[PDB]
C-alpha cells in the first residue's frame, strides 16, 4: 500500500519541523542530515510543499502551522527581494503561497503568489522571446540562456493569468514552453539541459550544460523536468503537441531505467552501480507519468501503462531508496544527486526529490495533485 510509506514521511517531517525551526532543508552532504539555509536558495518551496502535503493527508495542524510560518518567511523574502533574480520563482512560491490558497483559500497567500508571479514576469526578455533563467538582465554569459526546469515555473504564471484575467501571463508562458519544445528537446526524444539565444533577437545559438556529463548528454533530472513540465503546460494550455512531447520524453526515460528501477545521474555515462544515481529524477518522473495519464482518455490503452509505470517507479523508490523514520534520518529517499560534475552532494537527500516522492504518494493514495494548479481545474 502507500499509507506506511507516507507514514515514514509524516514522522520524518514532524521531527524535522521541530529541529529545523524556521530554517529550510536543501540537500544532505555526506550524512543523514540536511544542510539548512534561511530561505536563500531555489529549493525552499519544496519544504513548504512537503508540509502542505502532510497537512492535507493528516489534517494535523502542526504541519499547517509550520507551512504558514514558511509562507510568512516567503512574504519577507519577497519584500527584501533576496535572491529572486532567477526563474525558479514558481518552485519557491507555487509550493508555499499558492499552495496555501489551494488548501484553504487564504487571500493574503493568494496576493503573495500573485506578487511573486509579477516578479517572475520580470525575467521575460521580449527581444529574445524567453524567460531568462539566471543572472541580471543583460548578463553577458546568461542573458539569453534558458534552462529546462523553467517549465515547472510556468504554472505560477498560468495560474496568475487565470486569477487576474490578464492574457499576458499565458502569452509569455506559452511562448517559452513552445520555444523550449523546439530547442531543448532533441530528435531522439532526449533533451539538452540549457539553451542559449541571442539576447538582441532571440536567434538560437546552442544547447549545453554545466551539470550534464556533456553538452550533448542526457542529464536525467533534466529529462524528468521535461516530462512533468511539458505535461503541466499541456494541461493549462490544452496543447496536444506539448503532451505528445511529454510522452515521447517519458518513453525515452523509461527505456533507460536500470534493474533496480531508479536512474543514474546521466543516461550517457556507464550504466553500472559504480555511477552515481539520482533518485530525484525518478521521483519527478513518477509524478510526470501520473500527470500525463490524467490527461489521456480512459479508452487509451497507454493510460494504464503510464499509471503502472508510475506505481512501479514509486515502488522501486520505496523499496530500495526510502528512509524509515528511525528518529534520526531527515530525508525521504537516499541517493539523489545535486551537482555530480562539481562533486557537490552526489549521493544525498535532495529536498526536491523528497517533495516529488511525497507528491507521487499523495497522488496515488488520495488523488492529491500538488500545487501546480487548482484542484479539479
Q: What are phi and psi of 203, to 5 degrees?
A: -65, 140
Range 1-6 contact pairs with CB under 8 angstroms and sequence separation of 24 or more: 1/365, 2/314, 2/361, 2/364, 2/365, 3/365, 5/314, 5/318, 5/322, 5/361, 6/57, 6/358, 6/361, 6/362, 6/365
Residue with grid cell 514576469, as numbered in its chain: 121
- For cell 540536511, the residue is 34
Measure the CA–CA gap between 191 and 180, rounded to whole angstroms.
Answer: 10
In which region does residue 50 sit, left (phi positive, over 0), alpha (psi from -120 to 50) or beta (all else)?
Answer: alpha
Experimental structure resolution, Å:
1.8
- The span from the CA of 186 to the CA of 168, in Å, is 29
In the residue annotation, 106 being an active-site residue is answered as no
Distance CA 22, CA 33 (A): 16
The residue range of the domain holding 268 is 1-377
- Give the number of domains in the chain: 1
Catalytic residue among 44, 149, 266, 348: 149
Helix 107-121, helix 61-79: angle, nearest 10: 40
C-alpha–C-alpha distance, residues 110 and 13, integer Å: 25
Query: Do 185 and 226 touch, CB atoms closer than 8 A?
Result: yes
Report phi then psi at 235, rounded to 5: -65, -50
Helix axes 168-184, 220-237, angle to 10 degrees: 140
Q: What is the CATH number of the domain that holds 354?
A: 1.50.10.10
Distance (Å, rounded) from C-alpha 177 to C-alpha 175?
6
Cβ pair 51, 66 in contact under 8 A: yes
Looking only at the bridges linking them, the beta strands covering 130-131 and 124-125 are antiparallel
Which one is catalytic: 41, 88, 266, 348? 88
Cα 168-173-178 angle, rounded to 5 deg: 130
Q: Point out which residues pair with 24 in neighbouring strands.
A: 37
Active site residue 22: no
* Collapsed DSSP state (helix, strand, coil) of residue 229: helix
38 vs 76: CA distance, rounded Å: 11
User: Per-residue b/e over 270-288, b at no fewer than 16 CB within 10 Å?
Assistant: eeeeeeebbbbbbbbbbbb
CB 272 within 8 A of CB 348: no
Amino acid at each position: 500500500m502507500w499509507q506506511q510509506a507516507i507514514g515514514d514521511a509524516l514522522g520524518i517531517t514532524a521531527r524535522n519541523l521541530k529541529k529545523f525551526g524556521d530554517r529550510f532543508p536543501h540537500v544532505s552532504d555526506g550524512s543523514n542530515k540536511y544542510v539548512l539555509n534561511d530561505n536563500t536558495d531555489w529549493t525552499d518551496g519544496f519544504w513548504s510543499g512537503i508540509l502542505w502535503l502532510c497537512y492535507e493527508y493528516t489534517g494535523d495542524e502542526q504541519y499547517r502551522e509550520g507551512a504558514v510560518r514558511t509562507v510568512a518567511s516567503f512574504r519577507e523574502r519577497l519584500d527584501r527581494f533576496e535572491n529572486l533574480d532567477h526563474h525558479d520563482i514558481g518552485f519557491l512560491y507555487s509550493l508555499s503561497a499558492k499552495a496555501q490558497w489551494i488548501v484553504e483559500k487564504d487571500e493574503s497567500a493568494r496576493k503573495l503568489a500573485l506578487d511573486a508571479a509579477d516578479v517572475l514576469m520580470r525575467r521575460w526578455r521580449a527581444d529574445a522571446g524567453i524567460i531568462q533563467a539566471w543572472g541580471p538582465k543583460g548578463d553577458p554569459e546568461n542573458g539569453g540562456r534558458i534552462i529546462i526546469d523553467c517549465l515547472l515555473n510556468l504554472p505560477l504564471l498560468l495560474w496568475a493569468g487565470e486569477q487576474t484575467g490578464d492574457p499576458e501571463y499565458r502569452r509569455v508562458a506559452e511562448a517559452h514552453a513552445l520555444k523550449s519544445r523546439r530547442f531543448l528537446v532533441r530528435g531522439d526524444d532526449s533533451s539538452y539541459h540549457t539553451f542559449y539565444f541571442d539576447p538582441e533577437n532571440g536567434n538560437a545559438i546552442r544547447g549545453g550544460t554545466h551539470q550534464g556529463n556533456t553538452d550533448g548528454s542526457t542529464w536525467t533530472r533534466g529529462q524528468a523536468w521535461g516530462i512533468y513540465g511539458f505535461a503541466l503546460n499541456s494541461r493549462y494550455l490544452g496543447n496536444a503537441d506539448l503532451l505528445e512531447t511529454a510522452k515521447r520524453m517519458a518513453r525515452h526515460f523509461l527505456a533507460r531505467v536500470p534493474e533496480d528501477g531508479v536512474v543514474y545521474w546521466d543516461f550517457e555515462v556507464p550504466q553500472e552501480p559504480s555511477s552515481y544515481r539520482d533518485s530525484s529524477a525518478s521521483a519527478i518522473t513518477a509524478c510526470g507519468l501520473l500527470e500525463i495519464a490524467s490527461q489521456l482518455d480512459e479508452s487509451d490503452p497507454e493510460r494504464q501503462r503510464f499509471i503502472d509505470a508510475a506505481k512501479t517507479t514509486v515502488t522501486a523508490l520505496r523499496d530500495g531508496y526510502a528512509e524509515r523514520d528511525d528518529g534520526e534520518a531527515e530525508g525521504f529517499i537516499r541517493r539523489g544527486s545535486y551537482h555530480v560534475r562539481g562533486g557537490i552532494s552526489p549521493d544525498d537527500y535532495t529536498i526536491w526529490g523528497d517533495y516529488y516522492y511525497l507528491e507521487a504518494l499523495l497522488r496515488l493514495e488520495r488523488g492529491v495533485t500538488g500545487y501546480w494548479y487548482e484542484r479539479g481545474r
